[PDB]
Design a protein around this nucleic acid. Sequence first.
DNA 1: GGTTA
Length: 170
Amino acid sequence: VIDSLQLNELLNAGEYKIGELTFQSIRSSQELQKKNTIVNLFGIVKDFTPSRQSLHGTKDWVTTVYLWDPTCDTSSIGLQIHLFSKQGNDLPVIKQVGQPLLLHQITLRSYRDRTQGLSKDQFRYALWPDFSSNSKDTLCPQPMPRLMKTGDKEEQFALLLNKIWDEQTN
DNA sequence: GGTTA
């Protein structure tokens, strides 16, 4: 079982592994890159926009989230990520800021001088409750087609992320 | 693949 110190060392390495997946810390993901890359992310939802249908283009279902982790500062909102779906509205249903969110298969690219995340068509995700909340229904029912089965390792990471987020925002 | 946002 990991504690907050190990979590921080993990993140400070830029790239880190949890189970079978390799993630990129939010801060490193914010680094401006010339060429797009595909990554996995695990952070706290610092802000979000409820799912809705795009008005133009292919009109995909879309939800925006701002992901944060201990490598950014309480002052930055984090990495802006647009999650899309062309297979119905099966996007993460987020209820409040503070929820841990794990994203699998997110394209990182440059836009207006900032790195932005764009979900791959087949992206997957895991969403946790905002543990630090008094409310007990922070994690509502989620659509199934993009859900990832997770275990205790990811559970601890989520618990720690939320805790740190809370200590730094409370 | 980066329109949609």
